[PDB]
């Protein structure tokens, strides 16, 4: 019912409740350790939340034998190419599964009403949020599931768009094996959606577009000196 390769990819997944608890605790302690004169803004907390999520993404990538077949320089080139896409994809899948129309579900388990964004946020963030919600709706309609989510994460990470990889053959191999397993899986498990494979993949360029608008937004905030720094998030922002 499930391709053997997908079962192996599934072993790389973190335990969701442990990650939720860890990031929630981290953000609570961060704020508790600050005096009333140096409290983080909601924006600063959200940035640290994204930074912790990135740490968890790196831990996920490191647990894959495919990724470990790459020298550290190739590993860095892949992560630098897709970090924002993986953050966006993670966020979108979280909404598909746990989201309630009307609000946003965060990795901490908190929910945020969309009308708060609508009333409080500027045009860029609102446009980002609504585009994201459009993808969520499409994916929910396609019955996007965990096995397909893990395939998509691998397709995004092991990207053929990255030039100057030493071990390009390994990336080609992952693309071949993961596309094949995803195709077998969607046919076997969702026979009634006869174009599911093709329609899932059409979300990838959409994710890439949203991720580029998100990097632009975050970069602008960074120029304004607003993103907490000396962390993984700023490091990726500064990647070449």
């Amino acid at each position: 019912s499930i391709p053997h390769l997908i079962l192996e990819l599934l072993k790389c997944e973190p335990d969701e409740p442990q990650v939720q608890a860890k990031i929630m605790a981290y953000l609570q302690q961060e704020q508790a350790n600050r005096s009333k004169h140096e409290k983080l803004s909601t924006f600063g907390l959200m940035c640290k939340m994204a930074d912790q999520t990135l740490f968890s993404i790196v831990e996920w990538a490191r647990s894959s034998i495919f990724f470990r077949e790459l020298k550290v320089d190739d590993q860095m080139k892949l992560l630098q190419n897709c970090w924002s896409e993986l953050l966006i994809l993670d966020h979108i899948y979280r909404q598909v599964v746990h989201g309630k129309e009307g609000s946003i579900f965060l990795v901490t388990g908190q929910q945020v009403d969309y009308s708060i964004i609508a009333s409080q946020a500027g045009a860029t963030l609102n446009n980002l949020m609504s585009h994201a919600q459009e993808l969520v709706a499409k994916l929910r309609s396609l019955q996007f599931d965990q096995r397909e989510f893990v395939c998509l994460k691998f397709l995004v990470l092991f990207s053929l768009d990255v030039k100057n990889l030493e071990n390009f053959q390994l990336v080609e191999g992952v693309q071949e094996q993961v596309n094949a397993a995803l195709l077998d899986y969607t046919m076997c498990n969702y026979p009634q959606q006869t174009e599911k494979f093709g329609q899932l993949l059409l979300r990838l360029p959409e994710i890439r577009a949203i991720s580029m608008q998100a990097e632009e937004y975050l970069y602008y905030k960074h120029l304004n000196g607003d993103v907490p720094y000396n962390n993984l998030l700023i490091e990726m922002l500064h990647a070449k």
């Binding site: 740490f55 790196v58 490191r62 550290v72 590993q75 860095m76 992560l79 630098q80 962390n231 993984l232 490091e235 990726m236 500064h238 990647a239």
Partner: peptide, 10 residues
């Protein structure tokens, strides 16, 4: 990138 390198090299 120091932080990422440190993470991957651990």
């Amino acid at each position: 990138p120091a932080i990422l390198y440190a993470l991957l090299s651990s």
